[PDB]
Amino acid sequence: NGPSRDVKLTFAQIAPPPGSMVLRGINPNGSIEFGMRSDEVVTKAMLNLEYTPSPSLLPVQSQLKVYLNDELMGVLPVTKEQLGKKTLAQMPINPLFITDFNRVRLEFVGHYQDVCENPASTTLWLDVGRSSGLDLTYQTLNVKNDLSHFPVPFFDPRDNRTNTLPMVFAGAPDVGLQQASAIVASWFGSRSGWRGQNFPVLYNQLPDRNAIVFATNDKRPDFLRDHPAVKAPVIEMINHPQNPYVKLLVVFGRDDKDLLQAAKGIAQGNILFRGESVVVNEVKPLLPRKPYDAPNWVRTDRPVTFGELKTYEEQLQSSGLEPAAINVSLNLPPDLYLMRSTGIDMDINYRYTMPPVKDSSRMDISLNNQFLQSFNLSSGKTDVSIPALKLGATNQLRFDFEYMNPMPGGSVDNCITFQPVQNHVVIGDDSTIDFSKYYHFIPMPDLRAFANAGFPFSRMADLSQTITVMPKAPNEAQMETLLNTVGFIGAQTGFPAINLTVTDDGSTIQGKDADIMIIGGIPDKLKDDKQIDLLVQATESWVKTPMRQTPFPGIVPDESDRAAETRSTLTSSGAMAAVIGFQSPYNDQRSVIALLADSPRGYEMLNDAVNDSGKRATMFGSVAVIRESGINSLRVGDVYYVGHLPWFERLWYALA
Amino acid sequence: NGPSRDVKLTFAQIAPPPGSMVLRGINPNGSIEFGMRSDEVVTKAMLNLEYTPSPSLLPVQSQLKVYLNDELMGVLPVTKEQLGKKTLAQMPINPLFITDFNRVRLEFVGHYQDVCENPASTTLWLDVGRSSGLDLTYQTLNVKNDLSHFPVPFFDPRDNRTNTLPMVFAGAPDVGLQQASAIVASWFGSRSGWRGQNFPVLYNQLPDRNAIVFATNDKRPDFLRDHPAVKAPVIEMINHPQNPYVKLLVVFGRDDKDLLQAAKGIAQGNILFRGESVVVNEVKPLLPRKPYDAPNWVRTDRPVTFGELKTYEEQLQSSGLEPAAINVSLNLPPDLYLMRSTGIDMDINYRYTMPPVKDSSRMDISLNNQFLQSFNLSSGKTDVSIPALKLGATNQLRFDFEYMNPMPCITFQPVQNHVVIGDDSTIDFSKYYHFIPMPDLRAFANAGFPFSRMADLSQTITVMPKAPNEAQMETLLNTVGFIGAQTGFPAINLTVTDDGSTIQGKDADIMIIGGGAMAAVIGFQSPYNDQRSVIALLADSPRGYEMLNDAVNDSGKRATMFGSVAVIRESGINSLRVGDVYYVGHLPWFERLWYALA
């Protein structure tokens, strides 16, 4: 009935970062994870395995077991012909046991002797290659047009892929339509988060996937011509006119103000979505946002507990003979002034299963893949000071419990066989880390801060102090750039950009206390700015190169190194794009971030760089050149500080 | 369909000859690391091994495991016929798992008993001969003509070999063409610093490899007498007319001024390179270079943190059962005055995994394989003083963390250890002075110091013959590339001349190139300025020029150059200190008085 879709899930993508897995007698389990959308059903599942059982393995006694959601799918005994050789195995997977979240676990049973044997012998291994995969077939279901499960058909949280959500307009959008689409894109990005954002833009065209359609009583796409006129903003979930398995979210309104009201209702009142059509009556902003109040950032009004940092329950606990590391994500306001702090105070309350005798078992605390401190297990609330030099906008805290498991072996005459006992390790939810004793002071421009948190615009999570400058009649590429650059900011903040202001004149921003975002090229007034270190015309580009580009500089800007050495102007037909940042001429505390492209291919490259988190993480400094090869960043230009340092700190640190 | 290249690698750790690599229970791992050029793929790979397993090993329980990027390529179980005898075993390597950086690991699983096994038993060993290695067959690809990867096909950073980059002209170059070629060679040497640099020169002959072609409207090579006339300096990436795998970079311009502008654009504005052709419109300098601002050298204006000495992240940390040594490279300007103070102060912050009980675990600090001082790991700050007499050449600072790994029969899984050297560790060089007697060829052969005091070679004039030969251009390109490699910066402001009358009465250093085979390097004081100097690169025969270039590009030969005059002949390299001795610098009066009194 519904359309089908064949996917191959290679172990290198859905496995631990190495991709491969060596199953031993002491660590016999290894799992892969995959989810299923609420509008899809698996009709055919097959697990292809490429593994090499160790020689010296007893053939029929050594086996490899495959589990799906703790249900046995089959067993692969190690035939004598397979000892020490690469083997190809096809294990069918029953679709009746596939649910929203699915774990496929490989269990290895291994024996090398008919007599006394050591489970931890290093000769009992079976490594599964990363070329192994899980072939799946998905069939789309005809879900009913109910506005409950509102995001589900468009963004499904059970799907870990990039949320590709097309947006359909009648034509070139006006300022109000651009603002409403930006609000919707920001909300969808905040919902999708780490999965990624992608908003293809179609003008008067029906797409082949689930999409959002913006319509007005006057300006509407072709397929909505027969739709009756509306008296209020109406949100309808209708079927695709040609594909009943494709859903359309039609945001209909009398005009741009009605569409804006509907977008705000989507952003702030989606909990009341029901039926097949909803009319938005009024959204009342009772309370404004405060600086640095993004839901995805660490609160700075009081010490934050580890419970408020975990994203899912049972995250701060691990079990097993060798328990997996515990990871806590620390997201901070990018302008936290930590250049002077000796260290950040962190009180850790950790519980573990004590080994019977004193050994070298320990718990290792690692920040951003760097070892910080170690605590011996054979020893309440421990005080740990983490240096602030390596604290960025996005941080990862890892707690590794290295266990030396002393298992007896008896004597030479008489052996003993033991059953290993698993260990339990817990990091308490009462553990706290304090970030409330620091000020907001950053050496702008910081394209790293931009690409990591949208800082100049995410200082207010609703983007109320941000103005976006767009061309008069933007095309699909420019609208895609705006939607993607708003969606990724929404993803980092966790809050939709309800109060974002989009302008077109380019001169109304004069004398306004707002950070500026430029998409369709720098206006004439700001084009002659002396702080711009990179400008891209249709085919002519010039850049300013710093005196010294240290690969790993300290947090101190070192303005002597950042001084521009030479300015080189080059012209070519090859595509390029750039993101630049400079001080606003109208306010010393404000900033301007401009996304520049010279061609459709340049816009494609810029959009890909914005969408890809890995490509974004490579942006730093003041200018980020995007080419076919990749992204190259320069730390060039003047340094201006945004924030307020009280005179207490300045006087205290004047005398060291 | 392209050319193929065969290489043979050898295990990294191995041992000094005539030793061999032995894998034991403590660390049964042997690794081979190699990088891949972006224009090459591996067509056939194979690991040849010559190993002698211990005669007291359980045969089939003991195995050899080969990994490639943490992917098992195969296993080599020990056989009863192989116990105590030399065994030759081959293991194919799948090219599908080869990436930019590759690691081939040999893992040893050893067993001598069924119960009560001691991992530290002396009977668990596997000797691997030095003849064991990896046989690879690279194949050259036809890469796209994109300047976004501008240096990739000419100088590949992932290539560890010497970068041989032929330079093609149209004839005897003029002064402007010489200057532009020198700028380009300086930039390429700067990009390929610690690896060798060689720039063969051809006058009207296309080469068989990647090359840089300099052409003007009036003067073109024979194969370029079809390109339309250009109205601006143009840099173009084109295929070789008879070999689509060779690739050429064509620097086309109206005249020598346009070629110079294109060279400066290559040196500075390479971040804007895109497409198959770029047009350099204007390279406008804004700021000059201060002395001793070469990026390769340590800062002399403020204390240097260890983070700024890092070439890659995670260099200062190491993990494992026995963590590997941590190496920091220090390049010092070869004029610091260290005849007054005892040494150089160091502040070191290091964190480590504490052993469960106090033992003889220690950290060793080594300077150029010379043991300096050991510290004990038990409780982490540390203040050290380093004597400084290795100016110019690169210095390796090694931190070796040796753990005793005490034994708690009973079988246990060993726990890995983490050692970290802080990025806030500080070494100081800002509060010193610049003073050494200039007429030393060691300073030249190590850093190009008289000319490298300014990275851009602003205060340097080069004198060349009227109609230079291929060898006469090659020596200039080689020396400018060597200076660029030592500095880390292109020589954009280098001045070349054809007649010696311009250098009269100029406050700038002079580098003269002129004339069985004899090659001589002469250094003496500049007549027109007491603080300047002149280094002459003289050679009579073309063979003499060739051996001079070989000496200047060979590190071992450069290490045998000292004094004021060096003479290069087929019998060897001889250098005798002749002439007077004078000093350069700005030593204060009271410091001079204190030094004289001391």
Author numbering:
A (entry chain B): 67 to 445, 465 to 741
B (entry chain C): 67 to 445, 465 to 493, 500 to 606, 659 to 741
Article excerpt on this structure:
Here we present cryo-EM structures of the E. coli Bcs macrocomplex positioning all seven BcsRQABEFG partners and multiple c-di-GMP-binding sites.
We demonstrated previously that contrary to the canonical 1:1 BcsAB assemblies observed in purified samples from R. sphaeroides (Type III Bcs secretion system)23 and G. hansenii (Type I Bcs secretion system), in the assembled E. coli Bcs macrocomplex BcsA associates with a BcsB hexamer whose periplasmic modules of alternating carbohydrate-binding and flavodoxin-like domains (CBD1-FD1-CBD2-FD2) polymerize via a β-sheet complementation mechanism between the FD1n:FD2n+1 domains of adjacent BcsB protomers. In it, the synthase associates in a non-canonical BcsA:BcsB stoichiometry with up to six BcsB copies whose donut-shaped periplasmic modules assemble into a superhelical crown with stacking carbohydrate-binding modules likely guiding the extruded polysaccharide into the periplasm and towards the BcsC periplasmic scaffold.
